[PDB]
Amino acid sequence: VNSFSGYLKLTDNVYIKNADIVEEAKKVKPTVVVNAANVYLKHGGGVAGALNKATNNAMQVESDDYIATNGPLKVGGSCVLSGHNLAKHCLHVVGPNVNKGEDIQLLKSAYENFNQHEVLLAPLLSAGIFGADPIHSLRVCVDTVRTNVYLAVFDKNLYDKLVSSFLEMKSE
């Protein structure tokens, strides 16, 4: 498990790779794969749909059951559910939907959830359907997460831009 390979080390604990998170999970067999969720755990586009489809919809059914008994998450909150065939666990984390005006500062709260796990395979929260700047999401990740986070960025152009922008933010 957790056999990550081919990552660029950004900081002592943050790593990045140009890869699809679903194919990484199959290769790596992680203890925790992170889902970029919404508060009702209705898995639409982006990472949530890809993960769910790879579980043959098991993750959506499990999520419906979780909501029925526990109610919705808060923005910036999380829950641990099964990883099914992709990982031991899936950490469903709700970043702010800044397309809908939600507080971008809640992205720190979202990434703080990573600190409850030794090692995680993760995407950049809020940077897709939720419309946050991917560079900003990476900055919050680097400044917030103290545990080992392996980030999967599937788009090669975005990967290159993120590395490049990281170098500027780091050299000040």
Ligand X SMILES: Nc1ncnc2c1ncn2[C@@H]1O[C@H](COP(=O)(O)OP(=O)(O)OC[C@H]2O[C@@H](O)[C@H](O)[C@@H]2O)[C@@H](O)[C@H]1O
Q: Which residues bind to ligand X, rule: CB under 6 A?
A: 20-22, 36-38, 42-50, 95, 123-130, 134, 152-154
Smallest separation (angstroms) from ligand X to the CB of 89: 18
CA–CA distance, 82 with 153 (Å, rounded to integer) = 23
Whichever of 12 and 152 has its CB closer to ligand X, that residue is 152
DSSP state of 44: -
Whichever of 12 and 15 has its CB closer to ligand X, that residue is 15
Smallest separation (angstroms) from ligand X to the CB of 1: 20
Closest CA to 163 of 134, 129, 140: 134
Smallest separation (angstroms) from ligand X to the CB of 137: 7
Whichever of 12 and 109 has its CB closer to ligand X, that residue is 109
CA–CA distance, 58 with 85 (Å, rounded to integer) = 10
127 contacts 133 by C-beta, under 8 angstroms? yes
For the record, the structure tokens of 28 come out as 């790596």
Smallest separation (angstroms) from ligand X to the CB of 87: 14
